[PDB]
Structure 1
């Protein structure tokens, strides 16, 4: 384990070797204008991560900074992306915790990993933790057929996420989480996650700006009407418009005969290909060849849940 700023150290004698290794093993060039839409999530991150680093004299008392946020939405949009975006464009240490680190063969080695994780995140810095796929980790607490060791992991998160009983020695921490199934969190753990926020599928203008964003760096023609592509991809998620642009960019390879020249005269035709632009024929065939991973019953259920018990 390295030292922190201001030259102190950490006395990790009470925990074994492999637990320290398994918490140490979870420790650029992105920016928060590379995320199309999602205004209120950017607002909450701006007033709970970036503003206390600048003006710490304001957030004292009732205006204390937040310490949790869970993003709930359909499986297409940008939730994993906003965590790496806030990890790059900040000055705090980043803990990526998945559900496969809080797991060991012995008895009583998950809760000690969670305890060491929160102690390290409080010791180092004003850090933030990003628990990805929270619903495989904390489910309901009184279900039929859960193990007797996952219950202690949920109880450890419950005891550790609120605390720091001394009003002095206030070192900040911030827990971020993403879910596709938000109606399956415990009623006691859902209280600690203040600021439940829904993330919607992109609208018309978000689809237009995302097509404009991803189609730069590659030369296109001037006959592409972006309004027709923005109005014809009705029902597309956020991670399907990028797949549409990738299919439209490789269709300029599919229209030439490259399977025929098998090795011979193959390196020669690739020379003139890298500057050939993409006309409207490729976007027409890419619309004809790509369908969304639809079924908006999950989007409807998640929107009704975050409209009932949500706090933007």
Structure 2
């Protein structure tokens, strides 16, 4: 592990030589800063919790409490991960990452020291930010009967090391499998809904950039004829139209002879409206809506959303 800002050095000789090597492998991009096309409240909370206490540091202090957590829940198609990657590539904080794999070890006594070394590294390096992805697999119910004894010490060291600079963040897909004591430390549990008719039109106008498109397509009809689509299925639709541009010609029967001329003629052509019709004719939504309503019920019951 390297040094930090302001000239210090870490002494991790107490732990073994592979715990450092297994927690170091989680700590130069142009990721979408403004190109998340919903969730103004999440951008408000993140901009008031990471940037404004780090530009003017006396704006949020003490009785004006800065935040420390967020548990994003919702359907499996919306953009939870993109906001974490955007705040990773945007600010000047050492963005960590935690999976369900980096906290498992074959030996005994090595499944709890990793979390302690992780939080010590986060409170040593910088005003960091941790993104524990898929936290519903990490922390389940504590005192169950069909639970091995290896997870209770992990959640105990997690809750004992939670008190800590460090701004933790996590995103789930099943929020009701979280522990009853775990939700107390999560100061905000925000619901992330599927986009409405107003957001899909901006999604199509952003996802169809750089591609030559005919001036006959009507984005209101495309925004209104997709009742039920998640965030990702619209981008899949915009992919399927530009691939139908390729499959309209005959490129499977011919091969080898002067195909780069035909490929250049394919690169010359542009997207009509019938390609959007053929793309919307053969693309179905990802999942029928029950989990969206169940997570809305959970955030209405226990969440602050």
Note the C-alpha offset of 1:288: 0.6
How far apart, CA to CA, are the structure 2 residues paired with 1:43 and 1:139? 30
Note the C-alpha offset of 1:66: 1.0
Note the C-alpha offset of 1:273: 1.1
Deviations 1:30-59 (A, max 9, x none): 243110111111011001001011111122
Note the C-alpha offset of 1:268: 2.1
Contact kept? 1:158, 1:188, Cα under 8 Å: no
Deviations 1:232-262 (A, max 9, x none): 0110000110000000010000000000112
Higher mean C-alpha deviation, range 213-222 or range 265-274: 265-274
Note the C-alpha offset of 1:202: 0.4
How far apart, CA to CA, are the structure 1 residues paired with 2:181 and 2:147? 17
How far apart, CA to CA, are the structure 2 residues paired with 1:241 and 1:95? 30
Whether 1:222 and 2:223 are equivalent positions in the alignment is no
Contact kept? 2:208, 2:238, Cα under 8 Å: yes
How far apart, CA to CA, are the structure 2 residues paired with 1:190 and 1:309? 9
Higher mean C-alpha deviation, range 27-36 or range 41-50: 27-36
Superposition RMSD in Å: 0.9
Note the C-alpha offset of 1:143: 2.2
Note the C-alpha offset of 1:307: 0.8
Contact kept? 1:251, 1:282, Cα under 8 Å: yes
Contact kept? 1:182, 1:302, Cα under 8 Å: yes
Give the TM-score of the pair, scaled to structure 1.
0.96
Deviations 1:59-85 (A, max 9, x none): 221113111111000000000111000
Deviations 1:266-312 (A, max 9, x none): 22200111121000011000001100012211101000100111114
Higher mean C-alpha deviation, range 39-48 or range 51-60: 51-60
Contact kept? 2:52, 2:59, Cα under 8 Å: no
1:76 maps to what in 2?
77
How far apart, CA to CA, are the structure 2 residues paired with 1:124 and 1:149? 29
How far apart, CA to CA, are the structure 2 residues paired with 1:208 and 1:198? 22
How far apart, CA to CA, are the structure 2 residues paired with 1:190 and 1:156? 16
2:61 maps to what in 1?
60
Unmatched segments (≥5 aa) in structure 1: 164-171
Note the C-alpha offset of 1:213: 0.3
Contact kept? 1:71, 1:79, Cα under 8 Å: yes
Note the C-alpha offset of 1:142: 1.9
How far apart, CA to CA, are the structure 1 residues paired with 2:148 and 2:269? 59
Contact kept? 1:215, 1:245, Cα under 8 Å: yes
Contact kept? 2:135, 2:170, Cα under 8 Å: yes
Whether 1:212 and 2:205 are equivalent positions in the alignment is yes
How far apart, CA to CA, are the structure 2 residues paired with 1:266 and 1:260? 11
2:266 maps to what in 1?
273
Give the TM-score of the pair, scaled to structure 2.
0.98
Note the C-alpha offset of 1:146: 1.2
Matched length: 304
Higher mean C-alpha deviation, range 148-157 or range 195-204: 148-157
1:294 maps to what in 2?
287
Runs of 4 or more consecutive aligned structure 1 residues displaced over 6 Å after TM superposition: none
Unmatched segments (≥5 aa) in structure 2: none
How far apart, CA to CA, are the structure 2 residues paired with 1:120 and 1:224? 53
Note the C-alpha offset of 1:162: 1.8
Higher mean C-alpha deviation, range 154-163 or range 251-260: 154-163
Whether 1:239 and 2:232 are equivalent positions in the alignment is yes
